[PDB]
């Protein structure tokens, strides 16, 4: 089957956000066919992060997406090799977070390897002052873009005692399997819900849950 009904995950992440180098590590598990998953994150380097963790949570699983209707799963079809993704998130206040990700399948446990580069996050802004809450539920429009998938989405980051700091991202998904060995999907949508379950000792340990359900557009 390759991708089982319940799958284990292990993650490695490192980066610099406003030149503040850090390193993160994770262990998680989800139901790939149901679109749910859970991730327990631990910041191993760069002490208590000077920026809001929320900018990183969104880089911590395309393989855990409930493909309803009968949409070809580009992500699951890409195994055992896996797939890569490059995302660029642009914030309304000038902050830009670029992330590079590698997904592989080694000895049953699913492996994620992320690279993070955050720049121009304003000093007294919600991210740097750590005055952000969760991410509101978002929707990503995916369209087949020459061999891979291109995903665009507009997100809203909840703010401490306020409204939101909005942003948008452009992502490119590249399969490790050749495009010849893949049945590509049409233009489809993925609705996401990203909730933070737990938090410990100054955003050093964070538990996150995600729910993703794919669907063909309405008529």
Residue numbers in the entry: 7 to 66, 70 to 228
From the article:
True genetically encoded monomeric fluorescent timers (tFTs) change their fluorescent color as a result of the complete transition of the blue form into the red form over time. Here, we engineered novel blue-to-red tFTs, called TagFT and mTagFT, which were derived from the TagRFP protein. The blue forms of the TagFT and mTagFT timers had absorption/excitation/emission maxima at 405/408/457 and 404/406/461 nm, respectively. The red forms of the TagFT and mTagFT timers had absorption/excitation/emission maxima at 557/556/582 and 562/557/590 nm, respectively.
To understand the effect of mutations introduced during mTagFT’s development on its blue-to-red timer properties, we determined the crystal structure of the mTagFT red form with 2.9 Å resolution. mTagFT has a typical β-barrel overall structure with the chromophore formed by 65LYG67 amino acids located in the central α-helix. There are four protein subunits per asymmetric unit with very similar folds (RMSD does not exceed 0.4 Å2), which do not form any stable oligomeric states according to crystal contact analysis. Despite the crystal twinning and relatively low resolution of the structure, it was possible to identify chromophore molecules in all four subunits of the asymmetric unit. There was a lack of electron density around the tyrosine moiety of the chromophores, probably reflecting their flexibility and/or poor crystal quality. Unlike the Fast-FT blue-to-red fluorescent timer, mTagFT has an intact chromophore without clear signs of covalent bond cleavage and contains serine residues in the 148 and 168 positions (enumeration follows to Figure 1) near the phenolic hydroxyl of the chromophore. Hence, biochemical data support the formation of the trans-chromophore in the mTagFT protein. All four chromophore molecules have similar coordinations in the protein, involving four direct hydrogen bonds to R69, W94, R96, and E222. Taking into account an absence of the IF2 interface in mTagFT, this indicates the effective destruction of this interface due to the M151K, Y153K, and C229P mutations. Notably, the crystal structure of mTagFT does not have a canonical IF1 interface; instead, there is another weak interface (approximately 7 HB/SB), with one disulfide bond made by C118, of two adjacent subunits, where the N11I mutation is located. Therefore, mTagFT contained three mutations, M65L, Q220L, and A224S, that might be associated with its blue-to-red timer properties.
